[PDB]
């Protein structure tokens, strides 16, 4: 009682969303650290 085999119907699996937290943390920490270093530099040679 089998008509076709069609080994191509592969539904997408239970693919959860990719974790954006790590990359967002990286691309938010890099400019945050840059801005903090900039503020330190501004204090250093603006107040001396």
């Amino acid at each position: 009682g089998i008509l076709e085999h069609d080994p191509f119907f592969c539904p997408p699996t239970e693919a959860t969303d990719r974790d954006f937290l790590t990359d967002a943390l990286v691309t938010l920490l890099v400019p945050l650290l840059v801005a903090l270093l900039l503020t330190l530099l501004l204090a250093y040679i603006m107040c001396f």
Binding site: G1, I2, L3, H5, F9
Partner: protein, 106 residues
């Protein structure tokens, strides 16, 4: 959208719908095939709108009423008419073989 939308590779939609103001109109040129799969992922029953005839390939064809009362059923055993009435519109009519047993002729 506004216009066409080409699609390569399969389309794993959840529930296709139709516009309120227009009737959904699936179309093809060779055939339109609707399939189904068992727990083993194998095609067992399928309907096919072909070139000239609509072919239904399954194990038990059935036609029901809106509520759910059976109205017609064809399977491997024998065809069954559940409405309790048949009507042949052919000019040649029925051609019985030996005898007929009814309590009323109208």
């Amino acid at each position: 959208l506004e216009g066409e939308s080409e699609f390569l590779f399969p389309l794993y939609a959840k529930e296709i719908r139709s516009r309120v103001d227009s009737s959904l109109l699936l179309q093809s040129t060779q055939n339109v095939t609707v399939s189904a799969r068992n727990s083993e992922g194998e095609v067992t029953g399928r309907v096919k709108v072909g070139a000239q005839m609509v072919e239904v390939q399954s194990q038990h064809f059935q036609i029901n009423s809106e509520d759910g009362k059976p109205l017609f059923s064809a399977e491997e055993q024998d065809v069954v008419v559940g409405t309790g009435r048949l009507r042949v519109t052919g000019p040649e009519g029925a051609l019985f073989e030996h005898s007929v047993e009814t309590p009323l002729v109208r």
